[PDB]
Amino acid sequence: ALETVPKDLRHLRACLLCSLVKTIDQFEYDGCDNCDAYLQMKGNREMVYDCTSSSFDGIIAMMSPEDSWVSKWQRVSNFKPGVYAVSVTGRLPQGIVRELKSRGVAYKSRDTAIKT
Amino acid sequence: CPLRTIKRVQFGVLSPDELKRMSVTEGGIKYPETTEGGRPKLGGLMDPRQGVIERTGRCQTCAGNMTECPGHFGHIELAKPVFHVGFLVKTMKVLRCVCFFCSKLLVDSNNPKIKDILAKSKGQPKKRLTHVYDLCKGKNICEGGEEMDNKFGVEKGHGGCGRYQPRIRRSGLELYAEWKHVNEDSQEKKILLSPERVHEIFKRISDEECFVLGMEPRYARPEWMIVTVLPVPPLSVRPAVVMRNQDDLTHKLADIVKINNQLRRNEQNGAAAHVIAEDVKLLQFHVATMVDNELPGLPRAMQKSGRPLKSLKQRLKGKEGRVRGNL
Amino acid sequence: PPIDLQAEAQHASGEVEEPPRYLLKFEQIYLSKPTHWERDGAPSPMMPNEARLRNLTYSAPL
Amino acid sequence: ELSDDITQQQLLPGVKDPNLWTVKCKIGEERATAISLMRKFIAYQFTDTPLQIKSVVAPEHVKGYIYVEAYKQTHVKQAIEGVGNLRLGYWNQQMVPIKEMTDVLKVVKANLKPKSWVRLKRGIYKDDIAQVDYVEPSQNTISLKMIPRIDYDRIKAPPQRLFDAEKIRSLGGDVASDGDFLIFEGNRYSRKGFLFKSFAMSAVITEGVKPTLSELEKFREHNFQPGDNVEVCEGELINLQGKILSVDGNKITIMPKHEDLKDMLEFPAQELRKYFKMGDHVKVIAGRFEGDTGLIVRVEENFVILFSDLTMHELKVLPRDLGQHEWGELVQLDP
Amino acid sequence: RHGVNRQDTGPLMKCSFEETVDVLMEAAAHGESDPMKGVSENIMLGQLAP
Amino acid sequence: TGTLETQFTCPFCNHEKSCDVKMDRARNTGVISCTVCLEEFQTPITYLSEPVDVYSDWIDACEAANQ
Amino acid sequence: INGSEKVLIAQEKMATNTVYVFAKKDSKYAYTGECRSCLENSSRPTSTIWVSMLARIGQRIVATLPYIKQEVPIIIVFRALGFVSDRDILEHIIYDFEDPEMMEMVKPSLDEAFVIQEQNVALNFIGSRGAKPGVTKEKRIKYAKEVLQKEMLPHVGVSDFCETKKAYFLGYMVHRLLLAALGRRELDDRDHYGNKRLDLAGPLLAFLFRGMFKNLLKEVRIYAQKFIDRGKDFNLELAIKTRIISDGLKYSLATGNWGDQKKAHQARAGVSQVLNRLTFASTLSHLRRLNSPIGRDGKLAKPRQLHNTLWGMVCPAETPEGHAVGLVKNLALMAYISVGSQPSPILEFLEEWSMENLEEIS
Amino acid sequence: KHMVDDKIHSRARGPIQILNRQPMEGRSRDGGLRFGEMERDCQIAHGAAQFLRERLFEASDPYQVHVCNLCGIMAIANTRTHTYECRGCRNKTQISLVRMPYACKLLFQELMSMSIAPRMMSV
Amino acid sequence: NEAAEEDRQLNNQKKPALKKLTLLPAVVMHLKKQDLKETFIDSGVMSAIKEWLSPLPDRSLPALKIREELLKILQELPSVSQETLKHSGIGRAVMYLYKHPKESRSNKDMAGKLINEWSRPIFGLTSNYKGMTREEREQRDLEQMPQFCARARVPMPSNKDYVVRPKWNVSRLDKQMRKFTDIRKKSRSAHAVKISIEGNKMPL
DNA sequence: AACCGCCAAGGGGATTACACCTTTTACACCAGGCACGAGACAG
RNA sequence: UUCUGUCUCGUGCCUGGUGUA
Ligand SMILES: [Zn+2]
Ligand SMILES: [Zn+2]
Ligand SMILES: [Zn+2]
Ligand SMILES: [Zn+2]
């Protein structure tokens, strides 16, 4: 349902775990739809800016993530339908990446881009 | 400097290396703009090295007056090669005489009938190509592929690659290759012949074979018929009116520079081959219309002023052209 | 043909909406005499000869 | 530990996957279109004619189209039907071939993070290379290391050179010094002789910098031309000598100089170096003496020393480098 | 044009009458030389014709 | 107005100009085959029948069957 | 216009709503029953139909319908109009069956159309050649029905049930083609002035103004669309771009190019000329000048020759002696060009006299 | 209206066209009468080759260009310092000056812009 | 193999490794022979190409021409089986160039497409769209199935998604005409040698 | 295993359709055109 | 045994219309 699609295309940021793109106030108010039990970024901005980045390239509007090639290549097939970034730059801080490993979630770098 | 009279002239296709060497605009022309404000750009279409622009001014390259310096040539290094309209029919003939994939002539130069052509056409290349081309009509395989030519230390066959030849067809300004017999079940029967693919094919033609095709490599080597370095004419050939209002050639060159920039940029930032193909489709149109704007079928290039541009061919069209109207 | 405009459905309610449509019908035509307005908008009948001298276009508003 | 690329080859598209079809959108409205196409999909997904499309890709590097993935082309269409910015790409969508699909989600290196290198575009800082040190958590303004180009109100009714904090304190103005820390002329934050004032995000461009070694010292396009004698200095063909034929960006075609090798060879410009022999006549085309000419009198691996023909001086140069009056103007010389 | 352009005369003479451009392209592609012996070639240049 | 079409988009795989029409004027039958997905349809023709009529019979059979 | 006196030269053109059987010898047609059809005073462009007979068991008659990519046998067009039996079709062509000479000439066309009988099949046959390939059977048939109703022979009427009148008019065009082919009636002459009409300043300006006004409504459409898609209210006073008519009219009257400036190279030139104020007789004659749209440099003498039909209408002596000789004409002293009037008063009077309406008669 | 004073026209080195540098056209433009092709043919029939040469070169558009003896392409010619060079040959000598009409210079330059080398092989 | 070994010796001597680059034309001109590609692959060409693509003792890449032509050849040598790639190591030798920083972007694209082309069979994928059978598409299409005017208005093509595939809807005169055509031909005033009237198609 | 015949292909030839170029010399005047919407930053 | 003359060949273009031999 549409609560997951960007309200306005101003101030858009991509989650950095699942690359879902929403407006800054959408994350702040409702949180990230795919990744909440391992990151807990609902109710504050400090965690939001630590994990979630505004520097992303392209958007892929995923309508049927279950049945799509673009969803497979991108490792979003098991996520909720929504707008995703093609590539988000950055890395998590050296706290949650350790917590995630401790919790059995293998943090893999969403920086898909090739360098020069 | 001694006075001289033209005892002879010789026509030839300008080699891309010849152009880059004679051109004064080092590095090519990059900027669509003429003046960055007050002064002319050194790498734009109003480059002062490319002859003088203002009366009672001086050419940087030769210090000659407006009435004394010839216009010095410049060049645009095209991102992707493009066909040359006016040489396209000729490229189609050469491309149908040489075997695709390996560029050997489809009829060996040792063949008796070719020897006859060469024996009877000494100094008549135009007629030579016509006759050898008439031999390479009924030839849909590059014969002799069954034999190793170099013995590697262990009468002569054609020594071809054995590949079935495509029949090439023209669709306005684009060339297509069509295979009726395929070499491999995986090979596609119909491909768009990019000018880059025809450049690869012409580069491999040996100098002996292209003499057979009636093209002396000293003056008209076949790969030079593909535009890969575009000669920008000087300001003397495309002067600007002042009341500056630019000439039709400057406007076409502005478009060519714009797309050339966009295209090389799409290459550098790794755009998909289909983006490039749709972009080369535009660069090709503009280079073609800069020489021939009376081309059939394609939309005539028009300035938003509501009038068609007057290309280099139009400047030589006929009556009121350079030859008839000025010489 | 009278104008029929139908707004592009934006789907913001998340449902298939019935976008508003606009109708305009041009009716009676009126044409006044040829008139010249000074740059300040003051109305005057424009004489052909004035038009001929001032390079105006002798026309009437529709 | 299986490598990342090998585990990646597994995901590639095949004939059995939903094809990725190009559409045509209004430039800069590709993102607004793709998102509105999400709202369209959502609105129809429960009705009797749900949209048969899987994903809509709107890359940032492209400018002109979004791509709709659907099993059968006509599915792309029913989605884009009535959609305005995509009205232009309604009549035809080109299937990006299965081998030119992975390179749609291709990204080549946004880039707004500390310890990075950025360039300025507008204002007085034209084409200036800078470095980002820290970013404010509010993301309102960003701190940069730069060199000023202002005159300080004396030339008005300049090149790049390092700032100094003593020749500026005498012209006047509200100057406040507290040791190595200085403040002046509208909070010009300074410390240990260096400026640390913040920049406006619209004026600074992050991508397309690619810094050189010279920048590393503050805080390689070759001079090759056809006719140059060169020697290969790197790679498989080291010590091969040849003459340049053509120069195309950083690609150089050379004719090898051996009775045994007649064919043209192409090398990237990083792999060649000019070379000379005593007695060659050469012109300096760069550096400290650009425009001077002379005969090479001695050659060393480090440099060539040449005798300037007219000014008659010895002049050391690197192998890599080889309006006051007008013609006829009257000059006094002695009184 | 179909008769005289096919004559083995110089490219400039041909170019002076119909099909002016294509004949010059044809000569360029075939590397053809013009002997500068006819009235038209010497007239295109600023030479005293024979 | 213009020239009549002779190559068509396969109504199943939608590949453009992939379908061609063979007209067996002797057995009074037209055969259409997708050179991509190899789908085929055959319909009775007459001397007036043109490729556009065969393609139409294919479309009419598809439009009738997909109900 | 801008202080320049401009005169609209009267442009002659072929008389609409009339049948002309020509013989384009250099073609595959022995005869061509041309008819260029134009609804009423009501404006839209004229659409033209051609009922030709092939040159060459032989002498098949084919109609070239508007928007239909191929020639259609006229018998198929009659079946498409709903006249399925051959007797009924021929009743609209061969008014007197006692004429074996004329009937023997229609047999080749009845033969060619033997494989199609039901109306929907003829409509389908016409549709598949008009509509784009992927159109469904219903839309394709319905489209052929609309082309025959609204596009073929508009002057006959475009209402819901004009198909019987259209069958009679199309039958008359075939009957006349047969007459010409049999030689019972002489071919039509393109230079006979009874077959010509002059577009004076009125129909000339109406031709522009129709285009501009349609453009003006294009702009109100795109402007209001920009406002109403956003849910706001579009103010029409801003939507009307006044300039389109004003500068449109003015432009073509100023340059003489009779068409939209965006496509100037495609439209007629010199329709509006600077009035010749050198001598009063030149001013008077320039205001009385007729122009033939025939392209200059044309070798044909017939369009330039003083046709007998010009007697008393066009001056037999005043024509430029240059390249425009005979194409540019001048009105005779008492030559009047009809301004036009609606036919309804006449039709009413005819209906009250003993005229059988075409739809009622056996 | 055809009065002679509105028709009488004479010229002797008036203004020149900016493109082809030939006498302008028109009486108000102080133009020169066109020496058309039919006139060229009339002088050819006369055998007056020097008058023909004068009319079509000396009295219309006299021009000089420097050509490379090795390639016939027009070379760079700095007359102020008498240094002449043919970029491409890099000979900087073995260059020669040819008298050819400005329109002919114009033409060979338009031919290079189509990638045609009208090599002026004077030697 | 002799050429590549001699280039290793020359590279150790810090001389230009010309032997491979000198033989390259002769090799490329033969690897293109369609009638021999099976013989070439089965004779161990992949091993030799791996040797030529492999970096030299100083870990420099081979001559640019060698990479350009051998990568292009490999694209034109598709019959290579999985066991051939695994045994020859040509896969490693191209993945190496694809990763290598001194490789040019065009060669990286060729190596990238080669790696995709060669890995697809490992995963059973294929990129030839004409390679999927008719029944496979028909089945997949069922698998993907869900739950006024004054002038004639041009109708637009049906956008309907066709799922279901429809069942099919299923001389004495020319002998005399040929005889008359032959009589016409026989009556012609032909000549033994066709004289070129205007010089066109003049022989020799 | 040999020779007579029909079958298939080669190739050279023949006949039909679409593409391209050309269309007289000069000479005077006139008038009109010559792109424009619109969005981002600085005293 | 206060000065001071110091100025020398500028330029639209395309398209269309009418007219002259
Ligand atoms: Zn997330
Ligand atoms: Zn100069
Ligand atoms: Zn071959
Ligand atoms: Zn030279």
Author numbering:
A (entry chain Y): 2 to 117
B (entry chain A): 13 to 166, 178 to 266, 271 to 354
C (entry chain B): 63 to 124
D (entry chain Z): 160 to 268, 271 to 318, 335 to 396, 416 to 518, 532 to 544
E (entry chain A): 1416 to 1465
F (entry chain b): 17 to 83
G (entry chain B): 187 to 242, 252 to 557
H (entry chain B): 1052 to 1174
List sentences from the manuscript.
We used a modified Widom-601 nucleosome positioning sequence to stall the elongation complex 32 bp into the nucleosome and purified this complex by size exclusion chromatography. Cryo-EM reconstruction yielded a 2.5 Å resolution map of Pol II, and focused 3D classification with signal subtraction located all elongation factors except TFIIS and RTF1, enabling high-fidelity model building. Pol II adopts a post-translocated state, at the designed stall position. Consistent with previous observations, the structured core of IWS1 is located between the clamp head of Pol II and the KOW2 domain of SPT5, whilst ELOF1 binds the lobe of RPB2 and bridges the cleft of Pol II. In our data, we observe four previously unreported interaction sites between IWS1 and the elongation complex. Collectively we term these regions of IWS1 the Elongation Complex Scaffold (ECS) domain. Interaction Site 1: A small helix of IWS1 (residues 528-539), N-terminal to the IWS1 core, contacts the jaw of RPB5 below the DNA, bridging the lower jaw and clamp of Pol II. Interaction Site 2: C-terminal to the IWS1 core, residues 649–711 form a tri-partite interface with the TIM of SPT6 and the NGN domain of SPT5, suggesting a role for IWS1 in stabilizing elongation factor binding to Pol II. Interaction Site 3: IWS1 residues 748–770 traverse above the RPB2 lobe, extend past SPT5 to wrap around the zinc finger of ELOF1. This interaction positions two conserved arginine residues of IWS1 (R751 and R753) to engage with the non-template (NT) DNA strand, alongside W250 of SPT5, that participates through π–π stacking, to collectively reinforce the open transcription bubble.
The protein IWS1 (Interacts with SPT6 1) is implicated in transcription-associated processes, but a direct role in RNA polymerase (Pol) II function is unknown. Another distinct elongation factor, ELOF1 (Elf1 in yeast)25 binds Pol II and bridges the Pol II cleft to stimulate transcription. We then resolve the cryo-EM structure of the activated Pol II elongation complex with bound IWS1 and elongation factor ELOF1 and show that IWS1 acts as a scaffold and positions downstream DNA within the cleft of Pol II. In summary, our structure-function analysis establishes IWS1 as a Pol II-associated elongation factor that acts globally to stimulate Pol II elongation velocity and ensure proper co-transcriptional histone methylation.
